[model samples]
Target chain A: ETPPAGMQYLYGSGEASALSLQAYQALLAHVAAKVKVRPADSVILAEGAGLDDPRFVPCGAKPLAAVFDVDETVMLNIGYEYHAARTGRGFDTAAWDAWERTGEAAVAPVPGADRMVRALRQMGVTVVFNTNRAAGNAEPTVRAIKAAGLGDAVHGQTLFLSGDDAMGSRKDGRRATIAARYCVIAMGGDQLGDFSDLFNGGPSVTARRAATMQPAIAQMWGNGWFVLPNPVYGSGLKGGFDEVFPLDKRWAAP
Target chain B: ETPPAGMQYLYGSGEASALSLQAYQALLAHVAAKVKVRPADSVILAEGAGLDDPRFVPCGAKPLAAVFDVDETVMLNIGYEYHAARTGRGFDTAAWDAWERTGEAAVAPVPGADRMVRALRQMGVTVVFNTNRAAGNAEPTVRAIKAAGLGDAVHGQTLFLSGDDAMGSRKDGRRATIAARYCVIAMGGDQLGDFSDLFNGGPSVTARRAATMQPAIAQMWGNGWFVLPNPVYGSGLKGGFDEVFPLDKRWAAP
Candidate 1:
C-alpha cells in the first residue's frame, strides 16, 4: 500500500490546542503514575559530592556528587541588561548600568524554582549548578541566589563556576570533580554546553567555541540533563528575540 | 526589601500573548536569516538518521550526527481512537485494534514534524531516529516510519533501538551506541526518558505517583519538551482513560 503524502500527516489546530496547560497537567499526572520504579541502587564516584552531609540527606548512604552552572541556572545574574529590557518595561540602560555597578540583590526567584531545588536538597540529592555564566559573574550570581532565598544551599558551596583562573570556562572538569567524589543525581542548566564534558573542561573562549562546534560532544541534550526555559538571554537569543515566532508558527502554524 | 510572598512578577495578558506563536516565527526567520550568511563549521554525519547528510557537495566540511528516540518518537502509533472518543463516540477498542493491526498505513504524519526533519536533511545534516521501541519492534517501526514519509531520510542500520537481551531496558548502551557512531545534532521526543542518561533517567512511577498527588507540574503545561499532543494510549492513558477527569469537569458546562 502506498504511504500517505507528507501533507496528509501534518497536525492541525485541534491537535496543537490539546497540548495546552490543562492537557499537560493531565498527561503529567498519567505518565508519572504509570512510571516504573526500581530500588535506588545508584552509586556516586565523586568524593565530597554525595549526600554524606546531613544537609543533603536522602542519599546519605550513597556516594554523591553534584554539578551546577553559574549565572541564571544557579542564581540570577541580574546583570543581563538586555534580558531586563527584553522582558520588563522599556529598556533602561542607565538604571541597569547603576544596578550592575552596585552588584546589589536585584535578582529574584524563578517561580517554583526554589521549591524544586529545596525539595531536592531535602531528599538528600547532592546539588550543583552547571552554568555558562562567566567567572566574573559568579560573585553577583552567588549573591543573588543567596538573597533570593537559597540561604544554606548557596552558603554550603553547592554552587560551582565555569571558569576558575587557568581552569577557564570548562564545566566537565567541575562535573568530573564532583563525579570523582560522588554520584551525580542531576545536572541543571539552560545551555547545552553546561552538560558537555568536552567544552566544560577548558578555560578559554577559544577552546569553548572550538569544542561546541564539534558534533560528537553536542549530543547530550536528550539525556542526563534537565534544562529550564530561559526566554531571557544567552546564545539562544543571539538571534534577536523579536525575530522568533510564537507557538503557532514554531509548532502549529506551519 | 522583603521578598514577595507570591510569584515575584506578574504577566499582563498582553505580554503573555506576545510570547505566543506569532512572536516565535518572527524570531526564527530573523535568526535563520543571520545564520544564512554566517560562516559555520559543518557535520560529517550521514543524513539518514533524521539529520542532513554531510556527504553532499553543499554539505559543509563540518561534523554532523543524527539524534532520535525510540517508541513514539521515531514512528508514532497515533492513538486516534482516544481523540475520537473525546468527541463523543466513546472509546472504541476495536478501532484502536484495527489501526494497530491493519490501519497502520493511515497513521498520519505529525504536522510540521516531517518538514522540520526534511529541513535538516536539506541542510545535509545527519539525522537518526534514536528510539526506545526495543530491538524487537525495529522492523515494524521502520515500516511504519516509511509509511509515514520519514523513510526517505531513514534506513535500517540507522535504526537504533533501546532494549537488548543482556542489557535489558538500559538506554545508556543505546546512547553509547549512537555517541560512538555520530555527533548527535538535535534530539526531539515527547518524554523525558527519550533523553535518558540515568539519575533522572525515566521519571519513576514514584515521580508520577507524586505528580498524581499534585494539580500540575505547575504552569509548564508540558511545553519544555518538544511534546506533540497525544490523547491516545501509551503512558498518558494510565488508570484507564475513564478515570482521567470527566469531560464535564474538563470544560465549563455549555
Candidate 2:
C-alpha cells in the first residue's frame, strides 16, 4: 500500500484539518484564560533555559503576543506540495523560493488558523510570525498571509523572517526578538524547532524526539506551546528501519 | 531526503513520544477536574447522535473510567514493526497474530501510557482498554498488557477487544458494553475510530478526513478525547496526489 501517502493525505486531508482544529481549539481555550489572568511568566521559553530544565520568561507588563511559524502552522503550501508531488522531487530551494515569491494566491490557511489569529487579535494579543521564508520576499510572504485571510502582517513588525538576524533558520534568535517586546502567551508550529532550536540539535531522530519528552519540557505543550500536524516535509521526515527500530529491539518472523 | 520515513520515525521517534506526553498531560489535567466534579455525561457519544450534532452519553452515577486503544495508543509494537520492516511487508494477519501470541516482552508502553493508566487508577477512575486486538487471545493480551506495566486487564471487564462482539474490529459495540458499566470520561487512541466508528465510514480518504472536522466532533480532542501520533500503518495512510490535492488547488512552478 506504500503506507497510503500519509504525508500528503494527513497534511492535506480532513484528518489533518481535524488535528489543526484540535490543536488550535485547545490552544485557543488556554490563551483565552491566560489573557484574563496575568500569569507570572509567558509561555515562551526563557533565553537561557535548556531542554533538560526549561522555564518560561517572566511577564513584565509586556503586551501579550502569540508567535507562529508561517508555513504549515498558519498556512499550507498545497501549491508547493502539489508541484513537488507532480514532479517526483523532494525539495528544491529554487522551486520553493519561486513558490513563496509568486504563490501567494496558491496557499491556504491551516484549518482554524484564520479564526485563531482573529480570536487572538480580539483578545488584544499581537499575532507575530517567525518563519524561515526568505527575508527578500517579505512583501510577497505578507501577501500570502493576508491572502490566506490571516489578517495583516508587516515584515519587520508582525512578521519575523529568516534573514532578520545572524541565526538564519535557527528561529530562537527571531523568537527572542519577539519575546523581548511581547509577553508571548502562546506559540504554534508544525515542527519542534518553531518552538525552540534546541529541538533541532538532537544527535539522532531518536535522541531529538526523546529530548522533547523530558519532564520539564514536555509540560509546555498545550500549556503554552501548541503544535500542528505536518507529515509532508521537515526535520521529522528521516530515519531508516534500523534507526527507527533499534537493533537491540530486533525480532524476526518465522 | 524522501521524507525521512516519517511513518516509522515519527511512530517510534522521540517526536512521537513527545506527542503522546503532550496529549496525555492535557488529558490528565482535564480528566482530573472531571473526576472532582461529576460531569453530566461521559465522553462517549450518545447512541443517537450524528457527527453534526454529536453529544456525549450521560454520567448517571456510573464509576469514572478512561478508555484506550491498545496498539500504538498504549503500547509500541516495536517487535512486529521490526519484523514487518525486515520482511519489507505491510500488515499480514498471520504475522501480527503470531507476534501478539509471543512478543509480549518485545512490546514497550507508548511513552506516557503506563503512567497514564496508573494516574487514572490513582484518581479512582477505572482504567479500561477497548482495543481491536483479537479477543481470541484474551489471556495472552492480558499478559501483554501486564508485561507492558499497564497493570492488569481482566478480559470481559477491564479489557475489550475485537471479536468480543459481532461488530468485529469496529469498537462501538464494546464501547457500549463498557459505557454500560462505567462513566467513560476520557479516551486515547491513534486512529479516529478509537473515538467513534463513524470516522471510519467516510467514503474516501478525503471524505473520511473531513468527517472528523465537524464542529462538535472536533472539540472533543484534548477535552475528553486525546490522540497519539501514528504514521506507521493504519486507516489513515491512504490517498494519492490526486486524492490528497484537489484539482482546483493546483499551481505550476515557473
Candidate 3:
C-alpha cells in the first residue's frame, strides 16, 4: 500500500497546520464576537430541525459555551495513525480502545487549539467537548485532553462521549444534552456528524453533500460551524469516481 | 501505488463537495455584507505586505471585484485528473497543455461556485479570475470556464494569467494589476500562494505554516481570504513522516 498521504497532510504538513490554525482563529474570533453580544439563539441546531427549515436552540438565560470534537478537532492522533500506517491496517476499535487507555502522552494539541481554549476561558465562555470517544474510557480521555494542554474536561458535565446515551455514534443527542445546559454559541469539528447527526441522514453521498449546502444551513459555516480538514479517515473519505464526477462532466483525452 | 485515495477524496467525495460549498457560502455571504457598506480596504494584500505586517490595498472608491483562482477553486480539472489517474503518470506539462487546449467541455464547476458567481453578478460585484494558467491558452481557458457555466472570463480583463506579468507564476503582480483597476473584496484559491507570494517565501514547510498563523495575518482566513481543500496535488501534498510527525509526538504501541 501507499504511505498514508492523508495522514501526511493531516499529521505532518505545514499546510494542514496552517489550516488548523486558520480554523481556530476563525472560531476564536467568532466566539469572542458572539460573547460581546447576547444572541437570541444558540449555534446548535434545535431538535427536529431540517436543513431547509433550520432552527437553532434559543439562548434564553443560558450561559455561553463552545463545543468541540476531540480526535482531529483539538488533538492529533499521531500515535494511533502512525500505528495504523506501520501495521498496514485500517481502524480497529480494540486497537483504538488500547490507544485511548495508553496513548495519552503521545498526542499533540492541534495547532492553536490550546490557544483557542485559553482565549475562550478568558472570555467567560465555557469550553465543552462533545466527542465520539468511548464513555467507558472518560478518565483517560480527560487525561488525554489535559496532557495536550487543552485544560479540563469533566465527564457528562463538559466531556461527552459515545456510551453516554443510546445514540451510539450519533452526536445530536449529546449536543442536545449540552445545549440544554448551556447556550452553545460555536461548535468546531472535522466531520459533519460532529455538528449534527442529521448530516449522516442523507441516503447517498451526493444527497448528504446536498444537505449541508441547503441555503439556510449553509450560512452557519465559519460563522458558527467551523470545520478543520480531516483527510486521514472519516465519513468524508467515501465516494467512487462516477459518483464524484457525473456523466456530463466526463471526457476522453483524445 | 494506491487507488489515488487523495483523488478519491478530492474529485469524488461528498465531504469535499460539502467543504467547497461551505467555503463558497461563507465567501458569498461575506461579500454581500462587504457590499452593504463601503469597506475601508480591499481584501487583496498590499504590495510588500508581510504576513506579520500585513496591509491591504485601499478601497479608494474603485468598483468591487472578487478575485479567484481558476483550477480547483472555481473549476474541477476532473477530465485531466482522471486522465492522469488512468494513465498512471504524474503531471506532464505537455499533457496539461493539451488539457488547457481542449478540456473545456469536460471541466466541472466547484460546488457552489456558479451560485457564488451568479450572486456576485446580481449584486453588481465583478468576478475576476486570477490564475496561474498560461496566457497562451487564454481563449481555451475562457471557453472552458463558460462551458462549465461559470460565466465569461475575458483574457486580460476578467481573466489574469501567469504570463500576464513579468513575475511569472507568482500571482502578486497580477493581483496588484487587478487591484489597481478594481477593489478586490475577496480572493479564493486552493494554494497558499494564491493569497500572497510571501507564503511561498517560507524556507521550510514549517516556516511557511508559521507565516500564516502570525496573529494579524491569521484573521484574514474565511473573512476575506477563503481557501478550498485540495488533497490531490500542489505544495500541500509534500511532507515526510519525520517532518510531519515530530519526535516528541511519536509513541510505540505497547
TM-score for each model: 0.36, 0.94, 0.91
Cα lDDT for residue A122, candidate 2: 90
- Give lDDT tens digits, candidate 2, residues B1-254: 22236555555455556666767777888898898898998899878787778887888999999999998889888778777766767678888888878778677788778887888888998999998888888888888888888999998889998888899788888888888889988988888788888877656777776676666777777788887776667776777776667676678987
Model 2 spans > 4 angstroms off:
A1-4, B1-4
lDDT (10s digit) by residue, model 3, range A48-113: 987668899998889899999999999888888888877866668778888988889789898889
Error of 2 at A238 (Å): 2.3
**Which candidate leads the pack in DockQ?**
2
Candidate 1, residue A92: how far the Cα is off, in Å = 14
| Global CA lDDT computed for model 1 | 0.37
**Candidate order by decreasing DockQ:** 2, 3, 1
Residue range A57-138, candidate 1, lDDT tens digits: 1333344444545444444443333233224532454554444334434454433345545655655555555544444555
**Candidate 1 lDDT, tens digit per residue, B1-254?**
21110100001111111112111222122223423543232121222321111121122333454455533444444333223322433345555434433434534344334544565566655667766554655565676666766754333446666554356545555555655555443344444344333313354422432332233223322321233322222343233211222122111111
Pairs of residues at least 3 apart in sequence or in different chains that clash in candidate 3 = A12-B244
lDDT of 2: 0.79
DockQ for each numbered candidate:
0.04, 0.50, 0.46
- Quote the lDDT for B170 in model 1: 52
- Please give me the total number of clashing residue pairs in predicted model 1: 81
Model 2 lDDT per residue over A1-254, tens place: 23236465456455456656767777888888888897888877878898877887888899899899999888988777887777867579888889889988778788889988999899888999999999999999999899898999998889999889988788888887888999998898878888888887646777777787777777777778888776667776767665677665567776
Instruction: Give the candidate number with the greatest TM-score.
Output: 2
- What is model 1's interface RMSD? 19.0
* Chain A TM-score compared with the true chain A, each model in order: 0.52, 0.94, 0.96
